[PDB]
Structures are given as structure tokens and as C-alpha cells.
């Protein structure tokens, strides 16, 4: 019967909550209260990337920490050389409604997708010398919100159909399907070892998935609204989420609960993007109030503010070597800060 | 590495020339978001004007129009609707023939969205003939509604049909006038699915939207 199924589910949730409460011996705040604060963080803009016609949704740094890719609603993927500000490639998209872009770790491929429900993989190392559609992955019944390369032949995508997918680029087939979310899966983050990944959806919950078996390992709750961003800690044992409730939260894989909440009284706008520094001490979050906030990830203190953008900050990413952080906003400009 | 940097400069110059051409093409094209229910008559309007998202291209008086359809998307329109915050207009099609209350709630959500502000809405009150050939129980206030003095009924129209259609139009316009503030405007039209004037109505509304935006830039309005 449905009623006994519901009561079994609620008693299981009560047992899980009791176990989490039992494991909550101490708070991270009262543990890091005795460490020195990071002080005022004064980042400045060094480069301003211009050329995009419309608002920008996604950017992704290359593993060389020099080249990056940006996706705009005019139908353009642009590869920027952040050192010299020059444009390397300009890829026109068949569908101008792009919401995500990814850079392959090898740098030979780029990915995009959006309202067309298609994950387009472009080859940047063609013999002829021009960028062409290497592959088109289809099968999602909802808009593509995020995509991340595992390697040159495997990709992971999050869609608005409440499911995630693991695709083999060579065969173009959806090798694995991750189901369980009850809302639009908005953000995706791969672990440093690329063995697990966290997905944040519009059901105010985050889920940890194993790549091999395609099953949900843990579910983390605590956010009051839709989760728009997610990012692993550099260690890989924890992650951070930003939600529409104007809060960021730090969840732990081993503790299976939330450790810290980053929010302020005067912040009433949702978070669109989050990222960690190289050491994980700083948490950078982009907000709807046109600004980015750098928080002390260990003390939940507002370390600094990045206030160079004129419109909504849609994305931000930190280089692999941690030299600089690039923010892309709806004002059609990218800004590199350090 | 002067030669390596020279290659980057020339490649950037080529890319910027292509981007200038693309910008010239892009600024001369008007993008419209077509919203409506499955039974509201949106599909037949699309057919007359001619999987994730559908495209229609049409030229009116040598002016290009780039119209989009929702396509294969879930009813959860909370997130992807933001992607159309910068379109020229949202053509919202409502079947006037309680789906009317659902359409009103959707229109209210679109109008009051923080990102859909500054975006104008062209209201197509479709299926006017079905309403004419077909309210008190679903809308009690209709008992105390009178036809506005500014109404311009088509000749040979039953006064009851005119009263009903203008009541629906005023019900939709109440939301628009509640929080208009002049940042965006609503354009209602009494249309039919097979009407050939819908294209002209959209073109005229786009002209008015562009003129009002230009006036706002000069603070004249």
C-alpha cells in the first residue's frame, strides 16, 4: 500500500537524521574559531574579454590555466588566450540557446549544449585547421544544464529532465543513466579522481553518484530552494553548493551532513556559481546582485568582494594552478581577477 | 616568440572581422519567444506563419524575425524561461474559449518575474470564434462587468460576445497594469488561429516596442 510505503520512507528518513545528529559531535565553526583569519582579500581585474554579443552562461578553464572557453546566447563558443587576451577560435553554434560549455582536459575537444537537448562535441585539433562538429549526443528530454569531460572519450551531462547521463563520445550512446532527482538538475561537479560526481538539482538536494555502477551513494539536504551551483573541495571529501535561498553550504561526504553555512543578512539574491581556491581556503560565489563574494571557507567570514560586473554574474572558475579566477556575466564580458 | 604572437594577432583580427559581420547580422534580427498551451492554438499559428526547441524564420517588410517554440521541455519553466530575458517580445497565446485561470497565473508569473522585466508581452487571445459560439460560475465578477466605452466591436457582433471578450482582455490587463511601471508593456489582440493579420500585428507591436525603447534611452518617455 502507498500509505505503508510512505510511513516506511519517513521512518527511514528519521533514522538517517538521528544517525547524522549522533555523528554531529562538534561544529566546524567552533573548531576553526582558533585559527587566524585570512584577512581582507583584494583581488583586482587584470583582463577584460570583449567580443561576445549577448549574455554569457558558461566558461571553463583549460588544464593549462591559460586557455578558456566561453558560451554566449548569440550562438558563439569563444576560445580566449587569457595571457594575451587574443581570441583563438570562434565556433558558431547551430542552436543559439547554449547554457553550458566544457573544455576537455587534453584540450583537443570542447563541448556545448542547451535548449536543443543536444550535447555538441567540437574537435579543436582538426587536420584541415577549422573547428567542426565532432559528435552530437542526443537522448536527453530536457535542456542541458552542465557537461564535464572525464576524458577524450567519456563525458557526463546534466539535463532538465531530472536525470544525468554518462556518454561514450565514440559510439554516441548514453552508456549510463543516473536517476533519482525530482527536479531540474542544474549543476554538476566531477571529483578530482573522476570516480564520483555530485549533482545539484531544483529539488533543494544534492546527490553523489558513482561512475561505475551508476547509483546514488549519498543524498544531502539543507538548502531551502533550488541549487544552482556545486563544486568539490580540492581534497575531494567535501563539496559546496549555492542556492536560490541566498546561501552557500559546505557538505561533507564522510560526515554525510552540512558543516558550514555562508550567508549574510543583506544578501537576498541567489547564487549562480561557486568555486574553491587551490587550497580550498577561499570559496568564491557569484550572486544575482551583480557581485561575487569570497568567503573564508573555514570560518564563514566574508573575506572579499569582486564588484566589477554590470549585470548578473552567471559563471566563475578558478584555474588549475590557482593563479586567477575568471568570472563571466550577463553583460557579455569576462573578467580575470587576482 | 614574436612570430608566434604575430600569428595570434592575425588570427584575432580574422576572428574580429567575422564577429563584426555576425554582430551586423545579429543586431538586425528580432527574436520572439512564443509561449502557449498545447490546445491554445500555438501550433496552428506556427503553421500559418510558415526537438528541444523549434525555429521559425519570417521576413516582414524586409525585416527578419527569428521566432522560437518551447518544444520538448517539461512543464517546469522556472529555469529555462530566463534564457528569453532579452528577446524582443514574448507572444503569449491564450485560448479564450479552468484553463483560463491557469493562463492568467502563467501570465502573472511571466510579468512579475525579476528577469523577465523589461520584456514586452504580445497577448494573442486566440479562438475568438469558439468563444463567440460558446463564464459566470468560473468568474463571478463577470456578473457586474460592463463593456468599456472604448470598445470597438466588429460589425455584426453580439454584444454578449463583445462583453465576454473584453472581460477576458481586462482580466489579463489588470495584471499588466498592476506592476507595469513603464519598463515593459503588454499588447493584447483578439485573434483567430487562421488569421493572416497576426503577422502584421506582431510586426506593429515590435515597431512600437522598439520605438518605446528608443524613447526610454532618450528619457523622453
Amino acid at each position, epitope marked *: 500500500e502507498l500509505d505503508q510505503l510512505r510511513q516506511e520512507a519517513e521512518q527511514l528518513k528519521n533514522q538517517i537524521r538521528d544517525a547524522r545528529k549522533a555523528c554531529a559531535d562538534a561544529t566546524l565553526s567552533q573548531i576553526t574559531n582558533n585559527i587566524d583569519p585570512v584577512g581582507r582579500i583584494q583581488m583586482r581585474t587584470r583582463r577584460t574579454l570583449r567580443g561576445h554579443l549577448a549574455k554569457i552562461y558558461a566558461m571553463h578553464w583549460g588544464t593549462d590555466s591559460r586557455l578558456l572557453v566561453s558560451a554566449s546566447q548569440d550562438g558563439k563558443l569563444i576560445i580566449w588566450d587569457s595571457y594575451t587576451t587574443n581570441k583563438v577560435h570562434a565556433i558558431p553554434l547551430r542552436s543559439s540557446w547554449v547554457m553550458t560549455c566544457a573544455y576537455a582536459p587534453s584540450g583537443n575537444y570542447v563541448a556545448c549544449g542547451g535548449l536543443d537537448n543536444i550535447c555538441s562535441i567540437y574537435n579543436l585539433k582538426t587536420r584541415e585547421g577549422n573547428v567542426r562538429v565532432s559528435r552530437e549526443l542526443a537522448g536527453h528530454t530536457g535542456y542541458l544544464s552542465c557537461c564535464r569531460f572525464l576524458d577524450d572519450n567519456q563525458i557526463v551531462t546534466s539535463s532538465g529532465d531530472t536525470t544525468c547521463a554518462l556518454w561514450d563520445i565514440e559510439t554516441g550512446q548514453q552508456t549510463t543513466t543516473f536517476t533519482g532527482h525530482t527536479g531540474d538538475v542544474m549543476s554538476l561537479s566531477l571529483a578530482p579522481d573522476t570516480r564520483l560526481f555530485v549533482s545539484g538539482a531544483c529539488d533543494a538536494s544534492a546527490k553523489l553518484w558513482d561512475v561505475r555502477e551508476g547509483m546514488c551513494r549519498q543524498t544531502f539536504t539543507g538548502h531551502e*530552494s533550488d541549487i544552482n551551483a556545486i563544486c568539490f573541495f580540492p581534497n575531494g571529501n567535501a563539496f559546496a553548493t549555492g542556492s536560490d535561498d541566498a546561501t552557500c553550504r559546505l557538505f561533507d561526504l564522510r560526515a554525510d551532513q552540512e558543516l558550514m553555512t555562508y550567508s549574510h543578512d543583506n544578501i537576498i539574491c541567489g547564487i549562480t556559481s561557486v568555486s574553491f581556491s587551490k587550497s580550498g581556503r577561499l570559496l568564491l560565489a557569484g550572486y544575482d546582485d551583480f557581485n561575487c563574494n569570497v568567503w573564508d571557507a573555514l570560518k564563514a567570514d566574508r573575506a572579499g568582494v569582486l564588484a566589477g560586473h554590470d549585470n548578473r554574474v552567471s559563471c566563475l572558475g578558478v584555474t588549475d594552478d590557482g593563479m586567477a579566477v575568471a568570472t563571466g556575466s550577463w553583460d557579455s564580458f569576462l573578467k580575470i581577477w587576482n | 616568440q614574436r612570430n608566434e604572437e604575430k600569428a595570434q594577432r592575425e588570427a584575432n583580427k580574422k576572428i574580429e572581422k567575422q564577429l563584426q559581420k555576425d554582430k551586423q547580422v545579429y543586431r538586425a534580427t528580432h527574436r520572439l519567444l512564443l509561449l502557449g498551451a498545447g490546445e491554445s492554438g500555438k501550433n496552428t499559428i506556427v503553421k500559418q506563419m510558415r526537438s528541444g526547441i523549434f525555429e521559425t524564420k519570417f521576413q516582414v517588410d524586409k525585416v527578419n524575425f527569428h521566432m522560437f517554440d518551447v518544444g520538448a521541455q517539461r512543464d517546469e519553466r*522556472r529555469k529555462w524561461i530566463q534564457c528569453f530575458n532579452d528577446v524582443t517580445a514574448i507572444i503569449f497565446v491564450v485560448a479564450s474559449s479552468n484553463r483560463l485561470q491557469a493562463a492568467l497565473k502563467l501570465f502573472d508569473s511571466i510579468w*512579475n518575474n525579476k528577469w523577465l522585466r523589461d520584456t514586452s508581452v504580445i497577448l494573442f487571445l486566440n479562438k475568438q470564434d469558439l468563444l463567440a459560439e460558446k463564464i459566470e460560475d468560473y468568474f463571478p465578477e463577470f456578473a457586474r462587468y460592463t463593456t468599456p466605452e472604448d470598445a470597438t466591436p466588429e460589425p455584426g457582433e453580439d454584444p454578449r460576445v463583445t462583453r465576454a471578450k473584453y472581460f477576458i482582455r481586462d482580466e489579463f490587463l489588470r495584471i499588466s497594469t498592476a506592476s507595469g511601471d513603464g519598463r515593459h508593456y503588454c499588447y493584447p489582440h483578439f485573434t483567430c488561429s487562421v488569421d493572416t493579420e497576426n503577422i502584421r500585428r506582431v510586426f506593429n507591436d515590435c515597431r512600437d516596442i522598439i520605438q518605446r525603447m528608443h524613447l526610454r534611452q532618450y528619457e523622453l518617455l
Partner: nanobody, 126 residues
Framework: QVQLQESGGGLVQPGGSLRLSCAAS????????MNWVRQAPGKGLEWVSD????????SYTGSVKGRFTISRDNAKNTLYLQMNSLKPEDTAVYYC?????????????????????RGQGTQVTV
């Protein structure tokens, strides 16, 4: 996590009255605008009533206007729908829906199927 629990409802003679309640947990109740929706047998979800954050702005659908009243207690983190003089077509499963985001006038997808911020619903039958 977000948890909305609806209590009340059942069998009642036509023209009767009863008070549906809903208790909310896992979020700040005073920051969210609340809705009452219903699903009739063989029909889709239909919006019924709407109350703002402070309760100043209140709206109803035309079918139940003048018979249903909606209220909220922010201190008790709950809301109530008192229905008077019921009719045979009011038999439905009533759900309480929370607006997806706080400090927003718009409220998207409350009546859409598979909505995360909605309760399990309680049955009301004449």
C-alpha cells in the same frame, strides 16, 4: 529538508465547513509566498488560493471565491484554508505549494506535476 504536511479533510455533507491545515519545516516560512492547489479525480492540478509572505495580498480562484478563506501563522510556521458551504465538485486532493524562491512576486510551476516544494496532499470528499 523542505517538508510540508497537510492535515484535515475527509467526508463531509454538501454545504458543510472544515479547516485544512498545513505545517511547514526546513525553511523560513515568513520568507515564502504560499499557495493552495487541488487535483480532482481524472483532472489535472488546479490552483485554488494564494497568500503572500505577510498575508496582506490574498487571492482566490473564481470557482471558490466567497466560500474559501486562506490564512497563515508565521510564528507557528503554518497555514490554514477554511472552506465553507462546500459543493460536490470540490471533492479533490488538496496540496500546499511553496513558491520556489523567496522574496519573489512570481510563483512558477506550483501546479505543475512532480513539483518538489509541494506536500503529499489530503483528500476532501463530499
Amino acid at each position: 529538508q523542505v517538508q510540508l504536511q497537510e492535515s484535515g479533510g475527509g467526508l463531509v455533507q454538501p454545504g458543510g465547513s472544515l479547516r485544512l491545515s498545513c505545517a511547514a519545516s526546513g525553511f523560513t516560512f515568513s520568507n515564502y509566498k504560499m499557495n493552495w492547489v487541488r487535483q480532482a479525480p481524472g483532472k489535472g492540478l488546479e490552483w485554488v488560493s494564494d497568500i503572500s509572505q505577510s498575508g496582506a495580498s490574498i487571492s482566490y480562484t473564481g470557482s471558490v471565491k466567497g466560500r474559501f478563506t486562506i490564512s497563515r501563522d508565521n510564528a507557528k510556521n503554518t497555514l490554514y484554508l477554511q472552506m465553507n458551504s462546500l459543493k460536490p465538485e470540490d471533492t479533490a486532493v488538496y496540496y500546499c505549494a511553496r513558491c520556489p524562491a523567496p522574496f519573489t512576486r512570481d510563483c512558477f510551476d506550483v501546479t505543475s506535476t512532480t513539483y518538489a516544494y509541494r506536500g503529499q496532499g489530503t483528500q476532501v470528499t463530499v
